[PDB]
Symmetry: C3
Subunit: 142 residues, 3 copies
């Protein structure tokens, strides 16, 4: 039963990358590239969690990468306080991914809590939902 | 914990509805958008732990009105496999997430005493989503 | 009854996602997915009735294993990112939901003693969905 945090976390991360895998077919080339890099990061996070630390996880640089994109897109979005999900068919895909990332953050927080692993992964997922939110808004603007 | 899980699931619900609304007809799209508005109201109350006002009884009556309307259009409801059509499948997905949201809010109500109306709304919402899906297939 | 309620809710989510995904695959795969929906319907009946209603037969599991063996000859599985194509992405999504369902049913078997065959079916179902996703990508690459 002690592995539940591990199994639940990876199951949710798997759901996350699979939904991102679907969403990437609804965005432009640049955004698809960003989303595939994120799938790469999730792959690394799952490796660490699934191996209970035996396999290296993500770098701190991956967190800064997200933050850089967040700063960039934040500049393009005016209204961010009162918006309902899915302004467009395409942005709806990103909002769905956004909600899964938030659920993944929670599952990973638990893993860190009981195994001390996923420290960088937790912060990465926190920022990931922020970025997915902005990407959805940008798609609606563009 | 219950508060976080509930709003996370409600967020999931409105997001999936936000996706499904682009596959239904004009009338249903409007209905789904109003539902997103209601979910927003529900998330406000749960997320503020009661400080912010939630949905009104009128919203529940609104769903019930729609349920009554679509009920008279559906003959077969007992034995149906989800997704007869792409659009109805989208709604069936929303229906299952709504049912999950109902359970999460149920916990918030028992542990925080908030969300009584929201619980009823979500109960009726899944009934409506079921009917909308069957109507589309009809 | 939470395990029962939780399991059927997730199974309902599973067949609903499969019902959506079936509109994206070819005729042969669509038929396979609809048979899977039928199997999930049977699993839900057993769980929802706490055993009163008969569940799936061992033959259904054998059915999945047969399809798994088949596709195992076409897929050579590691180091692949989900959703190579929109179609395969839909299947990958179903695969993850199936894995969640498996866990929910495991709890039911544990606490109620029902769903033994269902647990194995769900375990194997995710393996099949994974192969179906890979096959779609492989066939697309060839062209
Ligand atoms: Mg944030
Ligand atoms: Mg009901």
């Amino acid at each position: 039963w002690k592995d539940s945090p591990i199994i639940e976390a990876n199951g949710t991360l798997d759901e996350l990358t699979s939904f991102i895998g679907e969403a990437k077919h609804y965005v432009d080339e640049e955004m698809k590239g960003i989303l595939e890099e994120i799938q790469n990061d999730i792959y690394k996070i799952m490796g660490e969690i699934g191996s209970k630390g035996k396999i290296e996880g993500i770098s701190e640089e991956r967190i800064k990468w997200l933050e850089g994109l967040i700063s960039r897109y934040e500049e393009m979005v005016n209204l961010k306080s009162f918006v309902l999900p899915g302004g467009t068919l395409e942005s709806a895909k990103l909002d769905v991914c956004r909600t899964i990332a938030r659920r993944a953050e929670r599952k990973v927080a638990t893993v860190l809590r009981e195994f001390g692993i996923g420290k960088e992964a937790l912060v990465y997922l926190n920022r990931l939902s922020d970025l997915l939110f902005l990407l959805a808004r940008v798609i609606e603007i563009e």
